[PDB]
Design a protein around this nucleic acid. Structure first.
Lengths: 208, 124, 104, 138, 99, 83
RNA sequence: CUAGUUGGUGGGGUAAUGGCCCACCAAGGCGACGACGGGUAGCCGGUCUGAGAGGAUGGCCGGCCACAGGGGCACUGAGACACGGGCCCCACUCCUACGGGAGGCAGCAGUUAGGAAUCUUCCGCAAUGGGCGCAAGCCUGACGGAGCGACGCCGCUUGGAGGAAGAAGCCCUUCGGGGUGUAAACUCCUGAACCCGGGACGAAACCAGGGCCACUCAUACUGGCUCUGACUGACGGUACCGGGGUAAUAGCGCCGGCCAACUCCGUGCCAGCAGCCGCGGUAAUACGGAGGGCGCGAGCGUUACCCGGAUUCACUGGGCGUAAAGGGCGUGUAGGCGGCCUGGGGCGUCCCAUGUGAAAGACCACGGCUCAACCGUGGGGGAGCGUGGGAUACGCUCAGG
């Protein structure tokens, strides 16, 4: 079971904003607002010069907690992105962004990555018609990711797809807010993501 | 060594020697207590380390440490040995597994209970 | 193909049989240098033809006796004890290196 | 005795260049001359020429160096930074055309001796052949 | 218990006996002949040899001698016989003997 | 006796046979003499039965005796149609 | 170390060569290039690790061998020295009217003993395949399945959004306050479990009626094609589809350094921790609890063992003045190595073709299960060795100088 526990506390430990809640993580309350110091009895105390490990560790934990994924699954993606041709760093990020549950989030259906995970899980999602309830499902280029008809009437889905009016979409995506459809055009490139991550250190961490 | 020498005598592969003849190269061995003495430390350290002579099913008669604040081991108590020496007690090469057979777990152990085999206390 | 080999007759001490000393070469499987080993075959010599010192071609045959599966196909070059010597001299060092020691 | 003529030559060369000799003699042998041919062509030595020392045949090897330098130790960079014997008596080394090494990522060479003559690793690969791996230069 | 295919053993014993009986006849005649050639008596030495030859080939008919087992027997026989007959023999009947 | 038969190679509930030329005595999933086709019982794909009729005919050419089901598949790929 | 020992001649036996076996003759065979003896081993495609070289490994699956309570033996057969066939001996078990009889799971399942430890006395012959039969069909603990045991791998579950300058409890405090913490409470949505309905692939042959071909004198056999053709599922009413529907297993290790994670309290060289260095004798980030934190998540941690780190046996890839390491010196055997020129040979060496290198695995590509793990198809690379052809610089050999 992927984490499930206080989350704005991770935002804090990474001393960087993490959108693990979609909304609110804007309204002066992501906590990273007037309280960006780590959680716990020591948060306010001065921080010491981190060790090379600490740095590589913290960097990976970030990139990972961003997609609310287990180390177990995370690692396998990485070792997969290591074998396949091309700059491991980005190739890795490509695969992370190809998770059906991520895409859903990326396409505005869900407000957060967690929410999207559930929508996919509870069947409210489609992939070329056939429904898919596997969050780890890998979306390929040229796949329509529509909202389940039976759910198209769901209060939740109508709100999000509403506010989704106007909101642009990643250059590797595209969506028809009408039939609540969207397409995975291509694998995003490192540039396409504004991730507060340095895969450089993530690769190095799995080097040790 | 010359190449021709290497061809003649060649390199000798290193052999490691066990540090735990718990025989059968087993993970654990059960034995019977004989003496529940109490040795004294070495070089600097000082105290009353609780030890126990054990007659293993492996045919060996050994000395084993008894971890924990307080134990309940006696003369003929059945026990399980897990291997692991004790830096201060020359001659003790294995620890006794607490929570198995006759060795009761440590009472009032609220932390590293996995070791000291003590069940989870029910928080009132 | 019935295997054919070439060696020297290092022994004519038996009846209708001779000891051919076939030499062989090859690269050491790990250190690569070309090493050179050798083996003795007892070959069938009916005519009692072949003599000590002869270079002969041995041919894989049907068993003739236990420890004897080769027949002297033919003679390649007669007389040349320079080879028998090595073989004998080597047998001679054996005459020691035990509780005493081999000459020089 | 002179155990390895080829190795003797690479060393004479390594030795002379380290002190910046202009020339440098090495007893002549068809084979050694064959090697020098490559050394020149690959531009490692100004060139070489037959000569007679004390009546016996030798090969003058005209050494080549970089230009003078700045700061302390104005000694020129060597053109022959390296030059090591590989196949050696009592440890011969032969390679198939698929095993011909790629010296210094291509910036260096390797002189082989093939049944097609003495060639450099590139030449050998072209002619698709292998053979005793004489040396390595870069 | 009871693996009714005991029958196999049951039959093995018969066959064993049937074979055993063919061979002993074979050996007896073989010597019989060799010994006649031995003593130089041409005619009867061959006469018997032919029987031996026959029994042998018949033994190879079913699975008694079978194979080259039969061949070996015949050759070792006709050989021994013709040679021993070199005592002023002159193979009369020349039965099992291509003169 | 040499046969032409099926060899279970699928997985639980996902059977996939291999029309094979083996000796009657081997495990059904043992070492065969040659592969000459494959068969997907559940036609999970448009290509659920290849047969290389060329080879089959060769094996039959010399005693290969097909299991019934094997023959029925060989017939489908017209190994017998003699038109 | 060894006399059937090494060879020979004649002979036996075999499908067949052969001291395989025998008679006679000769005077042998093996070893330091390790005979003989002792120990260990079932061996192998592969597997784990490793940058590689290499190291370790060979259980599951496939190939070979060996054994069948232990030892020996043959019969019958195409084939056995024959797990569920036979004979004798071995001790043991059982029946005995005490003379004498009967037995032998290293097959599936199961029992018992031993052990830290290893399953159902299950379903089925439907599928694969196998034995007999013309066929119908019979047999099939092989097999196909279900069951027990995160024992391993893979997948998933144990909610989502909002929600205070921030409840209470608990912890710390410079007593101002800080922390647990949007966490909770609560609101709304979502809705695993669970309920209701539908309900599968795997099965098409073998073989109900009709039509037709090949062979044939035949409308007698035999074989085939085809059509409308029919029967058959253990798993299982399971997967899956549709509708309804509840916020609803966690956890485990660690926070002195190596090593990511610190405060209070208790304890007082005690009780305890401990992989190493070490920690505890009144301020302990090292013992016990708590708060907080770090890691990972039916997972987490320990023990054991292998490699990695360990270039710590060094071929890749190390060394020997003083750190461990030159034998005290010579003479020389075997062996390793080889001045200049020419010619022959082509053994090493290099090239080409060809054969073999199994399958599985590894690599790349595409494909199947919602992904993946897993699996399918295809392709490429690959040492080594056999065969034919070729080259001749170097090494070797021969001849000459």
């Amino acid at each position: 079971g992927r984490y499930i526990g206080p989350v704005c506390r991770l935002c804090r430990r990474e001393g960087v904003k993490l959108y693990l809640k979609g909304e609110r993580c804007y309204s002066p309350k992501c906590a990273m607002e007037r309280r960006p110091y780590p959680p716990g009895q020591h948060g306010q105390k001065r921080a010491r010069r981190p060790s090379d490990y600490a740095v590589r560790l913290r960097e990976k934990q970030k990139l990972r907690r961003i997609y609310g994924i287990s180390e177990r699954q995370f690692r396998n993606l990485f070792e997969e992105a290591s074998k396949k041709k091309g700059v491991t760093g980005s190739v890795f990020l490509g695969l992370l962004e190809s998770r059906l549950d991520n895409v859903v989030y990326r396409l505005g259906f869900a407000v957060s990555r967690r929410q999207a995970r559930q929508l996919v899980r509870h069947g409210h999602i489609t992939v070329n018609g056939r429904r898919v309830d596997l969050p780890s499902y890998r979306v390929r280029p040229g796949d329509e990711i529509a909202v389940a008809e039976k759910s198209r009437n769901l209060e939740l889905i109508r709100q999000n797809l509403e506010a989704m009016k106007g909101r642009k979409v990643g250059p590797w995506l595209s969506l028809d807010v009408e039939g609540m459809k969207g397409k995975f055009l291509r694998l995003p490139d490192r540039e396409d993501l504004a991730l507060p991550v340095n895969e450089q250190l993530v690769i190095e961490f799995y080097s040790r | 060594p010359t190449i021709n020498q290497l061809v003649r005598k060649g390199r000798e592969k290193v052999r490691k020697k066990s540090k735990v003849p718990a025989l059968k190269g087993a993970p654990f061995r059960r034995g019977v207590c004989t003496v529940v003495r109490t040795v004294t430390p070495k070089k600097p350290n000082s105290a009353l380390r609780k030890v126990a002579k054990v007659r293993l099913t492996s045919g060996y008669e050994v000395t084993a440490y008894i971890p924990g604040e307080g134990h309940n081991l006696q003369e003929h108590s059945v026990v399980l040995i897990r291997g692991g020496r004790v830096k201060d007690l020359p001659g003790v090469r294995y620890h006794i597994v607490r929570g198995v057979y006759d060795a009761a777990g440590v009472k009032d152990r609220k932390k590293s209970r996995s070791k000291y085999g003590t069940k989870k206390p029910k928080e009132a | 193909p019935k295997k054919v080999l070439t060696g020297v007759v290092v022994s004519d001490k038996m009846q209708k049989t001779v000891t051919v000393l076939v030499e062989r070469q090859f690269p050491h499987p790990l250190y690569g240098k070309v090493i050179k080993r050798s083996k003795k075959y007892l070959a069938h010599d009916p005519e009692e033809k072949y003599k000590l010192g002869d270079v002969v071609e041995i041919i894989e045959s049907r068993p003739i006796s236990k420890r004897k599966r080769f027949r002297v196909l033919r003679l390649v070059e007669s007389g040349r004890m320079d080879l028998v010597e090595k073989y004998l001299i080597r047998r001679q060092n054996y005459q020691s290196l035990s509780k005493r020691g081999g000459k020089a | 005795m002179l155990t390895d003529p080829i190795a003797d030559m690479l060393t004479r060369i390594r030795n002379a260049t380290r002190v910046y000799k202009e020339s440098t003699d090495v007893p002549a042998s068809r084979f050694k001359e064959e090697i020098l041919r490559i050394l020149a062509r690959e531009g490692f030595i100004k060139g070489y020429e037959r000569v007679d020392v004390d009546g016996k045949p030798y090969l003058r090897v005209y050494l080549k160096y970089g230009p003078r330098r700045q700061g302390p130790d104005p000694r020129p960079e060597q053109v022959i930074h390296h030059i090591r014997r590989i196949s050696k008596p009592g440890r011969r080394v032969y390679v198939g055309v698929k095993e011909i090494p790629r010296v210094r990522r291509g910036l260096g060479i390797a002189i082989l001796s093939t049944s097609k003559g003495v060639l450099t690793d590139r030449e050998a690969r072209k002619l698709g052949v292998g053979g005793e791996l004489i040396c390595e230069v870069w | 218990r009871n693996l009714s295919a005991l029958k196999r053993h049951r039959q093995s014993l018969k066959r064993r006996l049937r074979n055993k009986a063919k061979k002993s006849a074979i050996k007896t005649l073989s010597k019989k002949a060799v010994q006649l050639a031995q003593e130089g008596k041409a005619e009867e030495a061959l006469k018997i040899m032919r029987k031996a030859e026959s029994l042998i080939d018949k033994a190879a008919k079913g699975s008694t001698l079978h194979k080259n087992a039969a061949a070996r027997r015949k050759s070792r026989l006709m050989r021994k016989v013709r040679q021993l007959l070199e005592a002023a023999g002159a193979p009369l009947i020349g039965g099992g003997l291509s003169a | 006796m040499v046969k032409i038969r099926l060899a279970r190679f699928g997985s639980k509930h996902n059977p996939h046979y291999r029309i094979v030329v083996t000796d009657a005595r081997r495990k059904r999933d043992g070492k065969y003499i040659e592969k000459i086709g494959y068969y997907d019982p559940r036609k999970t794909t448009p290509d659920w039965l290849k047969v290389d009729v060329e080879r089959a005919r060769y094996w039959l050419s010399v005693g290969a005796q097909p299991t019934d089901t094997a023959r029925r598949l060989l017939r489908q790929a017209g190994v017998f149609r003699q038109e």
